[model samples]
Target: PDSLFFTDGQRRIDFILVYEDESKNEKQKRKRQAYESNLICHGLQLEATRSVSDDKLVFVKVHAPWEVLCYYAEIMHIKLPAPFEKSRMNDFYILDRDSFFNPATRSRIVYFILSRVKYGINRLVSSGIYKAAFPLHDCRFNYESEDISCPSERYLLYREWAHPRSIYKKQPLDLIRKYYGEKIGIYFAWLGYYTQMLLLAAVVGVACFLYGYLDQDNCTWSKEVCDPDIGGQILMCPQCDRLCPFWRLNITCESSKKLCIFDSFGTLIFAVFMGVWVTLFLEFWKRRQAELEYEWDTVELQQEEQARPEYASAVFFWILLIIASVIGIIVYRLSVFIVFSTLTPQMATSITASIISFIIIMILNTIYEKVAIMITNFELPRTQTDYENSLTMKMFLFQFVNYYSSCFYIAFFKGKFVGYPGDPVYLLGKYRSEECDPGGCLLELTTQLTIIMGGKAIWNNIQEVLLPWVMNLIGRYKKITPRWEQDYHLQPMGKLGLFYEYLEMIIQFGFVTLFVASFPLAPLLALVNNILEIRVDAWKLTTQFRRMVPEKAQDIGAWQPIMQGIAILAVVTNAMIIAFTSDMIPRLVYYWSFSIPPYGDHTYYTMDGYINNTLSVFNITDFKNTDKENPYIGLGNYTLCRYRDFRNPPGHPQEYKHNIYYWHVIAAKLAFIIVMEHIIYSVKFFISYAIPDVSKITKSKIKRE
Candidate 1:
């Protein structure tokens, strides 16, 4: 035990009870703890002794309800008990529990006692501290304005507990009261969201069904359209009664071109995919409604007298729900229609047919909706939302796998039939005999020479000179030496930074060569380099901007419009060059040729002379047309057209050109793919923002309003 004595030794006393408090076995003595009035007075006696004073222990006791703790430092409330000393160095502490006792010692004792008493009372009422062991559910902390001093007197009181109960204390009247009034708004909101999602899914399914119908096997081109001449060709015969300029060729196209039923089946699969969204929203709404109902009933029963008079504020939620539904439906429907009907569909039949067959479509839509709901129920009893989400994601992946595989086959194989890499039949057909068609021969000669020159130029410069220098530069930059290790002051470059250095070196080499070979291969190399250069610059800009800017700086999305504008300019230039250089120049030299005029005395630079003398060797011909019976050249005599006459395939149209339509489709497809990539990028960013990784789905139910 410690003894307390005044500086001016008029009185001295031993405080054994205060010291006993610090050493007692708290578990054994909890029930036997008693009031210590003398110990409190001892602390008071010491505090009252200024420079010198005659004082001893008077009388003190434990404060009511464990010294009634409150955070008076909070903004909303402030309270003072007694006149406080304003010390020069520590004014706030003089007003706190340690105002009378020695500040440091008193704080340690007070904190210890307060913590124990708080836990003891909480254990009696709640067992809050052992929550994890107990596993209580639906727990809550209710605040009320009640009294601590008197049995019936009113005072602002709040409850703090770690555990909760699944079943709250309330009667039937309380449940009925909340059902009729307090939870009405959330109920209405639940109904509204549920109904709209249902309608949206139904409509989406119908639209998908219609899309499938138009593309379904044997549907678009009915059997009647190609049935009569199923296996027989309609030869261009003057012997027949009906004479026609063209003949219908009967042949079995491969599976790629064949009308596919699975294409429609895939869209139906997508409809099932969209149905998952509706199921998730519905199940989520039901769970939310149940939780909110329980919460409202508890609040209504426990705090009827203490609740704020502003119950009208709660109705605002219902009104907001109605307003939100109206706005949301407009936005959702518009987006759906625009994205699917306008942006996606090339054929008008899907959209128009869906409207006409509304009755049948609605039936199918209802079936999809019901199936989704059933699946959701089967997967989870009261929590089908998780199942719906997982299924939806799975369905999306499935659709992608099927669609992409088909697209790959179409791109690689189906496209090859139109133009193989080096089919002599397709190639030689392009040129005609100079005697028969001098213009065609001239056209072939010019294009061949231009292609050869372009190839030679690229091989001589890009491969022989520019590429080696670029490699050398990359090697030098990536090279590590003893000098780097000796220079201990500088930090070592990371792998990415080294990669950037290598890239920078290559680009520098490219720049030097670009200017040096600027006349012939400059434009071509510059064009190729610009594509990679712009992309590299974009990556650098994104990285540097993010690192250089502080958290409080502008958003990363802010410069997107500027970047989009730059992309637009690049596209326009690319389109102009591709169109003029590939299509126009070849057409001008071949089709609409205004060949130079000959002089008066001599035929100088005339078309005939240039065609016969200069472009003589490369001239090609079709000798089969001269003699269709033999269909052979000076090489041999044959009954049918040999390789020389292999140009005239029966199925090919006279106007068949390999590169014309395919290039246009490729360019269009690529442009659209780029736009989709941007959308996916933004969606990925937002999803990562929404779902943080540290916490699982725990504590979510309590946090929601």
Candidate 2:
């Protein structure tokens, strides 16, 4: 029989194997011997201090330890006994097992116990055990290991599970929270929200493309070479003699037309569906958040006790103060408006307004911050959440006004309400026409949004990720062990402020939802930014920023208000875009284009006809003095009317210039919104009913609590 020895000092422990005499043939004996040899090797590897007197008898020394027992059990896929107690720490403790069966029976039972153990050790590694416990690569410990102070380049570049490339890997949330903690996990949670929203964007993009495709053949592309806006310089299309203007103020020229662009009716239809979709999306999220809260056992977060009544009263007072602040802000805006009206050059006024708006916003933000501090100090909000909520509300007011005012100026005042200067060639004395043309309004909006969003992403990467990463690298060179440079598992952790991420996402949602009608590609741009945002934020949290304090949150607090606010704003913004910026208003107006007001019979094509006459006479200087209040009152007298004037033959029906009805269109838009809102509300109600906020298990747990 084969034998092995483990010695300590002069004492030698021998593991000797002996076979039973049950084998009658040499072939069986050889086979049994081979089996015994295999078992001995595995048993020794598992429990090295173990000694076998024979093939059927085993002895485990207490000093030898049972550390390898777990490995053996795992490899054999065997259920282990109850964990050994700390009190019984010696070899006698294990040998005492014979006391339960009594002395005589125990002597016979020893062989049986040893045989069962031998059978287990004879087994190879089990197929049921997963390889994840000992992954092929070191990606699992790379981030947490002290041997590597920072993540490896390969891990950062190629480990999709480690990085932000995919969140579908097994236990991704648990793993992220485990290594990086709750803050990053929550951030990724929000990122996943943004990622999923790309589905909505994709759906919208496809819808727009399909609509554009289907409508292409329907729109007439007539070869009539007409200069739609005679007041502006017209350039001829080289291919078809179509008068595509180099400079124009209105959507009159054929070159300015888009085949797939939504008219008033189409826009109304589109808006209704979008409104419904948004409402449903939010409603689903509400239930989803609740479900997550229950699953995460964070329902208590919502049940946090309210602050003292005095704090609530203080908050109420602070809210009132904000109202006063808002009133003052409105007064300031009105003053700006007055200045805009009195200013001789409209372009100068727009630029001045922009500059003044920036200054006001900055000033207001400072004041609001100071005021918030003063209120918090004086009233002493009972909870941090309440205190932060107050500050957020104050900030939201100023920022909302600041952002929307600029949008309002561009949308309402830029092109139509204000007129551009005439004699562009004479003024500049160059081929360039320098003017504020509203035709480029969509372009301006898109350019501003793209630059701002992209610049913000770049700046965030620099400040949050790049700078910190560089600092770590510099510390590495200097041999200074910074906090983040320490082993990740050893670093201090904390809860990151929820407001910043919430605010960022709210702004992104605004870009996607608010002005998507004006800039359809905004969501696509936002999606790309969001993907980069995840990586930048992940890198920032891990490498640059201080470790976040772990905090459990069931739902995004305070931010839900902003989300709902933006959704409501999205409806209004899209409605206005359809009405003002799109082909909707012009198409509908021209379709019913008689030169008449709703209440007045007086045809106000007077200004338009006069302009046409002045243009014919080449009296450009006289055109500048026309009344600015009713710049577009003469739209009917322009190209739309020229093609289908009242002077056409008796049997011909004028498609472009019919009797106009003004209030009907406004009423139609309003009615569309109301009906859509009603249906969405109904759907929301049904959704809420169908999906209970808490599961039965959660409810029972709550009851037990």
Candidate 3:
């Protein structure tokens, strides 16, 4: 009866069996005990045993699979493992309790349940090892199941309007993943990366604003009667702040200069914090990724590989790689040549370069697709990952080169030092106009990045969400059966799409790290775009696109190394910006020139136009007018001193005849570049050692194997 499966307050009594065990041998008893112990391990206890060997045996009741898993776990003092714990407890069947003690067959019911649970009936039945085994039916958790708790219609409506604002509060992450699939979950995982970074950006931006640190006036020179554009006047030091055109204070404004210096130092502190944030973010995500892998049961999953039809040679692959590389270099050079050759407006040049880059990217994409098809037909790869990796390398090489060329050109080749702006004299000559100043291209670069990233975000939404929705709406309006209805199947965006998103993000990150010195607002722009991107992508995945089949994924496949590579690049990029692009190094040289004594001049003159006469008495002098042309009169252009001079102080030299030139500036920049690179490398090594990519358990398991 149903009463046989009843449970008391203390424990669950799942079954009561009557067996012909009165004449059982000691060996049989021990075997039964062993079976009972195994059942107990899996949270199923043998309730009661009795000898009721009558004319025939009667049967009992059964419960749902999920119900059994829960109750069994509760009874055995264990928790149900993942993938099983989330399953809906709905699939089950009842068995007849009668005709169980047949002497001829000798099939014990307890042994049958144990076999079904352990070997899962299919294995036993297939092997013909357990004739008494019954199939263990199962069902997965269903998102649309009525039993599942869903937000009200009002909440769903609000979600469309609010996007993702507070939708997470209403609809949790697990429910979202369950409703959509693991692919959407992966998208959300990447989205979380930017959202967290947004906080860093916001904090930095607010701090910059409140403290007036980033409040520099690049137009300060143009604001006054200063006319370097017309070549009529040249604003010299103590009047013109070249480091930041927006900075209004110089030596004349003593207290203000001190404040400016203090704020500039703050910017450096913030940049360091951001750098550390980037590494820490990546490390945290690595750990979070492992947790998801465990939860999703994807630790052992591997992508399938197929052999190619034409697998006789590897020469073709090498040739293809060379062809791709050659094509990429050609594209890069051609784009750069066009940008520098045209005597157009700076904005026009920027626009032209951007257009050419996009065109080249498209062309390269087509070539990549065709080459990939050819390779697939011609050569065999070792694994699925190997094939995909090869394809990405071939395809993205040109894209990366072409896209970064314009920015590279502006940073290294165009204007002032490198271009025709102040030609013949180069760095020795001042920029003729504000447009071609040492830091002028900053505005152009910032605008270009912001527009490009923002445009991409908009276009991605249009393609993924708006276009699909419009098409479906049109089909419904025309009373036409959509082809998608017949063709609809779970097709994932796959590695390529995921790669594209990460590539876009990495490019944006490059802007933040490389150009943030020039334009401190780059992170703010990135944060805004990413905020919108997350919502747009979520909406597209859930509502516009067809569902993807759930697949086990331990991590973000190949993008892991790609992210690490970007982080490494960021360190170098930021260092280069600070050392070469900005006037930080030059300013430091200028400051050190005055602060340090001039070889043997013991009479230290106060900077306030006075010769300090024996510590108390002083001769008042118009120092600014007297020595406007020479801050370091006896020092003889100490701005050219080697960066090492400031620290080592020239070992008590006899005289201070300057031996350095403007070339020292370049050398100092290079020296610091090397220094920063070493520092970055050391930090990365330490972080890697401290925060391991894989768990210790995983490492031990790998070692054991």
Candidate 4:
């Protein structure tokens, strides 16, 4: 098949011009005829083909001569191999003089010509002519051009870089950089670098998981749930007032062992490890980023990108709109928990609510994306770059809130304010405020992170990989006789392509860093997903998607700051999770303070009565509105039931109010956070100051120059 080449077969086609004769108008005809005329006059060569199957459609193959490519390479201030060529003049870097300008360079030059050169006294609106210009890939990503020594770049990339088998092979980033431009090159680079960095974290992550597993049986609160003498007789209050039933503490004995794995001391240690891991990630990324800078420059040298739209938008406070969605999610959880509360396990309640929130999270994300675009449109960024930057920030902020809200609510705020037993507080006088599990909220946060991370990964793959492939496959059942035509029918590579790619990743980044204390295995989850992610993106980019117009970009824009922001925010969140949500601080305060003094007659500090200490007594007769609201009343001979809260028992001076233990635990939590938060922040700041963004070699080279 003659493809990605001209009729003459000597000049390589840089881009394709596409139109059908169906709407033959003096209008359409004059626009394109003059458009093609100016392209040829600018020394771009053109060859046209009438589709054999359609006969009505024409694909005009456009080629840029070496001279014309160099002309606008200057105009764009694009960089390349220059000088006298030293000794290798015409034969430099394995390119024949005939194929001198590579595909990326050729495409960039042709776009500059077609976009700037116009038709009929109008400037093409740049929009009207978009359908008319199509960039070409060499051939189908699956086929080969019969040479191992030399093959079409499409085949080499597919074979060596994009395929699943090649994922384990070191990425041929230089080859990818040459085929796609630096923007895409940098995207894959960062993802690969990020994936590599996680190897250490994942190993340590798994190690921490293992430590917790080995230590699970040793946890005193965990065993107390399984101990019949303790948990069997401890009747706990119904989560809701009427519909839910009184439950035995040991009914959740099976679930408590699972909680011990995530709630253990290892999670606390891994949280600190992750803080350092993120710092190591960004600092090393900058070093290697600078290394790539030096090499990519030494290869030939390496934005004026100040094109338009210097404007204002708060920066924030508007995307504060997402807080309402969180509010909506809270409403749904309270509403849904009512249904699951009948099943009467916090396990069932928490899992079902997580699934619901994930459902609504995606649905709201789908709608908010369009809304964000519309808002960005209203602000009117003058350049596509400026538009994406504005849109990127808006989407990032909204998604940040959207994705993290569930985790934030559960980890920081979930049982933070519930009134003690005998009187459960209400959200707005209608719904009962939620409570933590008898063991900990740590388990709920784990389930939430696992569900969202895995769900989004599965969810995004269908959107990113499956949808596009299915669309292209169906369209192929809709396409025609040639390579360019196949490409013309494939998806449009929009400016937002890379934006969506980076957006999904940074959200995942937040998941790995921000709530990592509750789910120490998160990096393992991320590590597995991203390993698959690299190949999915590469395969999708290489095959189903058409080659976008090649453009130059320095580094990942906006994502760097967004990632840095995640690193900073991670410190506060991890500190908060261990302090407030986990049983770590509570157990510590109990073992140290309450077990020793007038509060306890015990001789030595111990966890002997931790289960009883945390569970407050509430009399059945004291329930305010329950005039025999018995839905399977637990161990009914007993008048007293237990609810897990650090509050006064009945018959006390201040019955059912928070006790001295509550304030002691509160001070302990606050102190741990203040200390942990400051120390981690200090480490992160010291790392930032010690490791320069630019490497010493790059700095030395700069000074020498």
Candidate 5:
């Protein structure tokens, strides 16, 4: 034991685990003769704190092995190599190492050496540096009951052991400690890189699972009944060849039925499993409480109640836990309800019942808590806490809202969108909720905001290729965004109205994604919804400023009706887009070469041609014909076509060919027109059934009065 008192107010003692052995001559000869040695040593380092005096060169020293030969022998032979192969010397070699040098017993050494030059070099240095350092724990010396430790301890420890052999032995231990600290930190940083690999493996595993599940399709075979226009062409049935009043939309009916069965069952299962999750969540809280209540064996019995405020704070935390738990259940229920409704209309009523049951369960739970506490004076951990510290509630709301919005959107748009795997996206809904875990909402919001604002390839794919086409297929506005044909009857009064419709389509969907990516806060939800409302209102005002069309004649005059239809369609389109986008995102983001529609649509670009076109023969100016009496817009001949024919205009040579984009656009527009007609007819049927006697009711009531 050294008689020196360390500045730490504690007497220093040598806690040497190993000492130099001089019994063996071969070891001595080897140390003197063979391998390259760079004064190889390891020791701990510590910072000179207020506890350590700055006045003198304090010797917090430890004795090192006088013979590097023996150290190497023991380290190489006795100690097992790292469970993970590392390039560093093992403890066995550190203790004895004729084992390291002997050719007959040197396989481990060779293996370690080979690995080091390959994979283990970095870790070896990191571990060696760590061993050489002083404190390996956190320390604030604040008496805060945490594992307080000084960062400089490891370095100090290493210097304490290493200083004796070097010419620097006469130097201040403080200086040695500082040198060791810097080196140790470098090694520590080297070791921290393993975390990236671990994290990557985890993410890749989850991504693989999600990709497989989301990329699959589920087609349902249910029944359908379609009533015809009173004049359904007086045409014979294609299926049964009968004078039928309607044709059956059996595919649609079957899809609806499958959704009803699967959704209801899933919701029920979700409810049961969530009950288990809540229980486990409560158990975790209980463990936390137990840890707080019982002092550690190291804790002094004399610790006074003067720190009652700490316990009081703990009690408050438990109260918040209960409240947070309750709120979490509510949000979870809401999410499930949205999912159920979206999946199966038949499940919607049962989902409502489930919601009622969930609320009752919560209330009953609260009542039970009050009764038990009253009788036993028993309270949960931190039960008396304030709501301000309730992170659970905040986190739950964020995830719940995010999921609710995403699931609802999927419900309405899956069939409409080509890329949107739709209902199948729901399969991974649970997993997404899992991977995001406690921070799901935050994670989604962060990722989505990053993509949306920065304009990633994913966002562009979703917006242009996935959304517009898919929405046109599934939405209510048959007139504006028709799947096949134009609904001339459904056209708005002005192009500005149409413009608003497009803008609103963007805003509505953008907000839904924004919400999913960023949920939980009422204020945030309000902000996004308000922006949507404002844009929509502007659209409405613009519609009002235009020439009014009669309400009976496809009321596309005021943008309100179209806007309403679009608002609903927006929800549907966004859902499908989100499903497709989420599914495709992982593939597109990483493996851009994989063909996953929208993201890899080279065919569309190739066939439709590029977005821009150039004229070869003549320009717009060539067709300008300024005649007051004739008032012709162009010099093109009207006999064949009013617009300049691709090659020959009224007088120009006819050698030009039409751009590919030109023909594609024409065909697409024609298809849109036809689809628009079907949707118009379908919507009219709905309107008639839903509100059939409106005019008759008003007329009869007026007469009777």
Candidate 6:
């Protein structure tokens, strides 16, 4: 009745399952009753968390006798060693030959079995009866209480290579192979080092990030937008119709304040800087991988570990989830107007909306991960390679839309094409599609992206910790449950799981690089996330998670090229973000072109009337569409208002026709991209050329005559 044994004391406990009322656990129960019975009928043992946890959450452990594993193995066609002989023992560090199929290997078979066997056509975890089903480890990694025989096959692995609490030592790749098996050994060896220099960018970005914004208040635009005599006097046209009231630019000074904090000269530096840095990073990593393959002796092996599945009817349920999720945000916009226009004139909607966005995203994500796999397995692939790529693409595209959509809608299409004080787009004359306001529409756009990026950084960190820890807390909340029993309850990386891990890192990559122009400290945030996340990852896999089923892991594919794809997108997106979108570059060009003698009085470049040159006049009385303290009081016989739009002034023919300055700014903005991209990309090709993808020594071996 201890960790390894059942209540009857007959068999070694092989697997565990944990559940609670709501890690969406209501998705559990009946799905399992018949299923666990089915597994038991297969000559397997089923153990579940007993008393308190059942009322709150339950843990179930599976103990399958060898007879069952062997029986299923035949059905499973797990490569038999018939005349197809091959294999490993102990000794480079350690093995027991007589005992083939040790406990570790047994569960690997056990896990894949649970995956295949069905309960009326729905699997257990995928159908939502259990939180996760997993196998238990034999002993503790730091077994102080039990072992003086240096109790540590597991302990030995932990002692030498566990994440350093501080001081820097090097990776012991071979040591990992001796302990955990070759699969994870190479798996993490590459993963850990591959992501290593994220620290370098983060530290350097930090050195410049928050500090970069230090003189933010000193920027010319910040002052003019906030000054009472300047931006305060400039009233903006309502962004939408109906409840859309004219707002003041100076009022958004607090927003402007944050702008200085997140957007600046430095973000552009970082955006372009990363173009070069990620270039070098991959080249070096390629070299490391080449060397790893060289030393581990698998180089040409994968010149061969060559390649190798879904339902849209099911996706119909989740697709409307995000498109309407955008609608959900659009709806929130109206309520936000009431909150600010009615009470707090200087009120905020972005940070809250951003959090609102994240909350909805996480739930869909929690559900999608399972659905994603269901569809992946539904179409059986020929090899492990194709299977992973299948799962990887599903997750990648969905998350691309899932996490990045809000930012996407906001960036280029948002606020563009709205009626310039004419007919509204939504309900009759009600919600005119949104608009770009002077002094702060761009400000609002950048802030919205920044808030989400920054919040996601914390949210995901909290997610990795709280969700798992609480799952664990609920397990023990009900330990000494047994070493193996305890390990069983923590979550499985789940159906092609390592990719799940890299997915999080990739999302953060999108954050730091995608619209970095909007969020400078996002890099700084990512640095903290990656550094802490690495530690949390190690702790969970080692102490919390069930031992991962050992399988061959190799160069993570597709994600690499896409990251390079994302890196280039960062360059173009960031260039557009600043040059065309941030409102910074337009201000600069207007300064040299019009705010000068070209349009000014014997002037050197000045921003004094920079605000005046950009906005176009709108007659207040002609309101084809339509705030605060005495909503009508500020109407001091002033019949016209202005907005940060480029149009001919009112009463002119082609009244809202794009103005000269409009094309002027567009030309300049495009020029910025052409120049910046060519210079940086020209350097990119040269930089990539010089950095070795295969180092001299490593290449020397492959170069052998």
Best by TM-score: 4
lDDT of model 4 at residue 427? 71
What is residue 337's positional error in candidate 4, in angstroms? 2.6
The lDDT-based order of candidates, best leading, equals 4, 6, 3, 2, 5, 1
lDDT of 6 by residue, 345-437 (tens): 333555565556666666677666777777777776667767777677777767777776666667766666665554335633434465554
Each prediction's whole-model lDDT (CA)? 0.28, 0.44, 0.45, 0.75, 0.29, 0.63
RMSD of 5: 33.3
Off by over 4 Å in 5: 1-248, 257-261, 264-403, 406-705
How well is each residue in 494-542 modelled by candidate 4, as lDDT tens digits? 5578888888899899988888988888888888888888888888888
**Tens digits of per-residue lDDT for model 5 on 1-705?**
111223343422111111122331565335322211211223221222111222222112222232432344354333232221235545334433322232211322222232232212223324321111111111111122121322333234333332223322222323321222222222222112222222332343334334333422431111111123211212211111121122223323433332333222222222222223222322333333233223111121221221111124445535644664555445544655455444345335434534443344334444543443342233222432222113223322232333233333333222222211111123334321111110012222232232322232233234533443358467846611110011111222432333333333333333433233122121233233333332233223222132122111111123333334433443333333333322222212213322235434454222121111111123323322332232223333322211111222224343334444334434544453345434544544554443324334433443575
Model 6, position 233: C-alpha lDDT score: 86
Query: Each candidate's root-mean-square deviation in Å?
Result: 30.2, 20.2, 17.9, 4.5, 33.3, 8.1
Angstrom error of the Cα, residue 610, model 3: value is: 21
Instruction: Identify the runs in model 2 with alpha carbons over 4 angstroms from their true place.
Output: 1-171, 179-184, 209-270, 299-379, 413-447, 467-496, 592-705
In model 3, state the lDDT of residue 689: 72
Off-target runs (Cα >4 Å) in candidate 3 are 1-171, 209-231, 234-270, 299-378, 415-443, 468-503, 506-516, 594-659, 684-705
Output candidate 3 Cα RMSD: 17.9
TM-score, each model? 0.21, 0.52, 0.55, 0.88, 0.18, 0.73
Clash counts per candidate, in order, are: 4, 7, 7, 0, 67, 7
Higher-TM-score candidate among 2 and 6? 6
The segments of candidate 6 whose C-alpha lies over 4 angstroms from its true place after superposition are 1-138, 142-151, 159-174, 181-183, 207-214, 244-247, 261-263, 297-348, 377-384, 422-430, 440-446, 453-494, 625-636, 651-654, 692-705
Residue 216 of candidate 5: its Cα lDDT?
Answer: 25
